[PDB]
Amino acid sequence: YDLINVLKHLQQIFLGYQSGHNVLKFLTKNMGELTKHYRNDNNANYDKLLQNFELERQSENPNNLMRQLLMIQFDTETKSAIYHLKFDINIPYPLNIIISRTCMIKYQIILRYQLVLQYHSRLLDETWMDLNKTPSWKYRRIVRATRVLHAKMNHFIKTIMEYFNQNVIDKEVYSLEKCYRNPTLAVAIQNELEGGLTNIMTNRCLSDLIPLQLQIFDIVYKFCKFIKSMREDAALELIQKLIEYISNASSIFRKCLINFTQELSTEKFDFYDSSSVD
């Protein structure tokens, strides 16, 4: 079958290690739809799109078990749209000799937390790009705020992303390939998967990143709509709200970076109350 190459691919795509650009392309295309709570048409558009990115890059691996069997699952309509996105893997043969219901659920949660951070980054980039072009003009207080807000926002998300990738996904995949290589034992496979799930479990309990980020994205999209158009009292009102939002966010973020390294839940507990409602 060439199991080992397929094994490598499973860690790469599914675990969230390096599927990278394709995930990015998915987010960019989806971005308008994902801003909205939900709509009936959304699930179909996402399935077609999901499928569409896989086709387009073509082949690059002898086995495209990952590209095909990977499916997008919906909790409802099969908080906002991003929270409802979920993954189901149909699983290849001959390889599901310890696979249980729990494991797919677990690989899915590590995907979901990384996925919201990457999406916020794509939108943030998009907002900058708009302000440069001609209908913005007024190079006024609005322009200066877009610049200031951009710097802060990008760095905090990038640091959350750096840790998420590093302490979790990248750390775990190094260990799974090592436990697999040295013996030929079946038991070794089951042991390495188990270990990986318990580390997932500590990440699941710990994380609750998604409620604070969802609130920042909605404000940003209003800011984005305003900036692209020609510009009044109203522009100023929003401009002032944005800085207040950001200050409050900056202090929360700074506390949050310390927790991924530490694996303590008390600092985090403060973070849960912040994230829900500022």
């Binding site: 790469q12 290690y17 390096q18 943030l124 990008n154 992303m161």
Partner: peptide, 10 residues
């Protein structure tokens, strides 16, 4: 491959 979720723009 170490990262691939980073992009040129971000």
């Amino acid at each position: 491959p170490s990262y691939m979720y980073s992009s040129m723009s971000s």
